[PDB]
Symmetry: C5
Subunit: 224 residues, 5 copies
Amino acid sequence: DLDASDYTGVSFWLVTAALLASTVFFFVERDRVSAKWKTSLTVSGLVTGIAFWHYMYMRGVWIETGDSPTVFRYIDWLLTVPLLICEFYLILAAATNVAGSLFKKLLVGSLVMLVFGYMGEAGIMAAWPAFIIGCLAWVYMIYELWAGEGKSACNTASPAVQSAYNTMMYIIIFGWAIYPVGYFTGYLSALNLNLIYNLADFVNKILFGLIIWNVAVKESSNAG
Amino acid sequence: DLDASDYTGVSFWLVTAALLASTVFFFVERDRVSAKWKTSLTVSGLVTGIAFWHYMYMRGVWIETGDSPTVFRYIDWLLTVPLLICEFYLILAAATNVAGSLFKKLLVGSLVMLVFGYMGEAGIMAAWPAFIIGCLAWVYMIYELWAGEGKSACNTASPAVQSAYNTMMYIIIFGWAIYPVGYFTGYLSALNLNLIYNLADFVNKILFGLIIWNVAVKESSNAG
Amino acid sequence: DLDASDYTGVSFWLVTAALLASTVFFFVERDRVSAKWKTSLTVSGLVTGIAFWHYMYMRGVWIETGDSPTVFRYIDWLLTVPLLICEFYLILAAATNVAGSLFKKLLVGSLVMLVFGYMGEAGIMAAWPAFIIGCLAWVYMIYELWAGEGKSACNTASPAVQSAYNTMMYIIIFGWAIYPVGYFTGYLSALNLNLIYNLADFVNKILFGLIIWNVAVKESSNAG
Amino acid sequence: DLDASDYTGVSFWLVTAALLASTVFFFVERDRVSAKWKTSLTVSGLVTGIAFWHYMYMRGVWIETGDSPTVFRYIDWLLTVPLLICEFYLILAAATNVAGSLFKKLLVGSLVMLVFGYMGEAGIMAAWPAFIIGCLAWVYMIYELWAGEGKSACNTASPAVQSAYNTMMYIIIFGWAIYPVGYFTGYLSALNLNLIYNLADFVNKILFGLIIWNVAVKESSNAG
Amino acid sequence: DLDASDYTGVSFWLVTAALLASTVFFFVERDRVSAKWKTSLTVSGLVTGIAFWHYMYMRGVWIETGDSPTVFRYIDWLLTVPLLICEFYLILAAATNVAGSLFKKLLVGSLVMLVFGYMGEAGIMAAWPAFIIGCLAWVYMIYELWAGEGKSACNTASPAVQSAYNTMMYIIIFGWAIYPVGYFTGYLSALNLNLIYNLADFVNKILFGLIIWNVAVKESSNAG
Ligand SMILES: CCCCCCCCCC(=O)O
Ligand SMILES: CCCCCCCCCC(=O)O
Ligand SMILES: CCCCCCCCCC(=O)O
Ligand SMILES: CCCCCCCCCC(=O)O
Ligand SMILES: CCCCCCCCCC(=O)O
């Protein structure tokens, strides 16, 4: 039985279980969605599925060592963040006709936020400059959602899709903002940084995928 | 081969097997249900699936240590109790048109019953005050089912759904009442408390999900 | 590589493999059956699935210890025998309209045959009285199938269902009779008792489920 | 990393991987086949699935010991050979109306070829008489395919099914002939016998199932 | 937590995760494709599924030993390269009517490129002659795609299929060219050779399968 002194150990176990439940939920709930939205729910399951597969290894590292598994942490982000950006393309493709140029601009900004974030936690370029650079890439992320191809594409979509797109954008706004909070807490320690990161994937990976499922089911029921 | 002296060890093994069978049953029996009820049977499978995944770890703790895995016990409840409350929303959504405000009132009451229950078993706020507080949150749970949005929503539903809603409410009445019985037995010991909790999840997690499956299949066959 | 001196070790391995193949067969062959019979093939897969999950543990006990895993044996029966009795209800429900009162009478008789059977193998109430009591509960089992609600329900069913019902009844007659044969052999030893029990689940769990699949496929093809 | 000196170790690993891929292929490719042929592709997956599950244990025995896992080898054949004979019945049932008396004659001949084959490799009845007896049962196998109920049933089938039936018969002719070649090589040693047996299951279990899939897909596309 | 000094260890972990995600994606995304293209997405899942199953063993070898798992590397190629060549046949079969003689010419050339490639890494026929011979078989591979049955078959296909066929041919051109680059780097060392091979399967096994999925989904949506 798990300890009750270290909240981080509880979070590693709690989150890991939630990502396993979410992965099964997303892959199974593709029956309720139309063939256009089936790809959107698959990518959500992959994000939670990869994150769960990465959290199992990270949970062992915490018990065996007690230090933050930074290398395992950022490798998972390097694989799941592009798939989350793909969700913006998929919903605008399963509802409207979008070429997808906004995908490239968001993907480049996301990679910059992750590449510099890993370097700061590894001692490269100290930590304060990394926090500023990671923030600026996050600032570029929010700007392209206010004005871009997606904003033009979201205008012609159904009101249900528009509400989802705004909610997903908010998640980029508030949810992705909590990562710099954990970065600030853990370097400006390790126990709180891992706790915040654990809770972050609860929102940015599970709540993000639940918004996709809700809009897909509403649209699919309309068609039947 | 399992011992025959400790009934708790038998129950840990017997329950764990039943939750694995129930998990496969719920995820597979989504073929017999309409697309509206497919989400209801998925959540039932998640509850049994998470509980099974938690009972495997708890079974090891009992053999390795011999003490009650309280931390593993309440973490599972913290994850499965909200999903069981979601079943009340889902059945009223797959049968009627419900906004779902009763979900919030039940969820808040359920969390209070679990947060204080864990503290009592950990020595926080003794045990007698925790039993009273946990009972009162359980008393609030039954009151909102007698009068609330669900009661208004259940009135307009089909007689098959109404029978299920009443049966689910009963399970809240009798089934959830057995947890304070185990709490009273184990602190007012460990062998009986774990035995009762094991048997409790047999009713509140498996019988609860079988009521959902029965009503979903009856409704789906009517539509075809 | 497995030994060639102890036929029991071969049977534990040979049966365990057959139950894994049967479990996959039953859960996969639900595509060929109508939505009414899909529940019948699920329960067959659960019986073989639980039995396989129990035979894996029993196989280890035999190699590690060399004694009969009685406690693991009867726990599996306590979980799978009710599901086999449920098959009588399901086929009469997927073919006719049956209330299901015969289910209670068979279930009570089955539990008596298992409760006293475990006690005899554990030294409770010796072994000779347990064999007589277990036989009488088995004698009550066959009487209710000759005359009962199922016999009334089987009359109105299709000739394909009637042939299956008679075949399933026979399995209760001959197949369930082999368990007292192993009980008599092992106490009136261990090597032969485990060998018979291993072969018994080959008929009463796999051949029983193949009869269900055959009748379900014949009926489903008629509807299309 | 695997050794490059012992070709048998490579074959055990190479075959085991092919049977896992074939098992997933057969169970997944049931979407492309009509409900009549879905049972035929299931049995092919069971044969490869059981063989894969048996090859994993045999691969360990080879590394741990270095001797031929004869007992594990023949137990797999005792379970998969009847299922391969069932393929002749299934294809003639999913294409024509066949009672299936040829199944009994082939099954009896197959069991004789396996029972005596195991005895020869265990020292019972030497090895030369076992090779002759095993050959004669194989000679009876080919005779009943030239003239029997299947030959009468294959006449009325579609030309696509007839080509498959002839190809399957050939596999009995050439493919099953390679087992006595390995038996002759290994006793008239162990390294070559295991290598031949490994390659034999590549043809008689995978190529056999690919013929079933090819004919099922051609027939299903005709119906749509 | 993984080391940050050896990029090869990161690549082994990063690739292995991508192949697991790709395998689930390909087998799940068969819902969005027509029954003609379902076989094409299955083979893509098998390639990534076998490669993932092989990368798990190779990752252990790298940590345990630190040397290149050449034998495990080429066995995976011996099993996955023919399946990738089968993709050219499948897409031309699910879109047009092709006999498939170009499959034999490409398969023979592919095997020559792999047989000689393994020998060079094992010291057989040195390394420089192996690089030249492996290049020539790769040169024969590109020539038959410019002129062959596939080029004749691709002419009559839809413009969507033609774009996919050209993209797949390019992957043969650029993607398969990176293997000799790693061969040249690692012998004309081990750290860079494994890194290149890891990245190679990211393109030639995942990007190759994503081209198949994209064209299958576009064609299936047209039919509905
Ligand atoms: C200032 C530090 C910024 C860190 C950003 C971390 C991004 C994580 C993205 C996500 O998990 O979906
Ligand atoms: C007075 C103690 C109350 C304890 C309540 C425990 C709640 C468990 C809920 C459930 O398992 O679904
Ligand atoms: C006289 C002893 C009777 C033993 C009965 C054992 C029942 C097993 C039931 C079954 O396996 O489905
Ligand atoms: C003369 C020896 C004959 C050996 C026959 C072995 C049969 C194997 C059948 C098969 O693997 O499908
Ligand atoms: C000159 C050396 C050529 C090496 C070719 C290796 C082929 C790998 C094929 C592939 O991975 O799909």
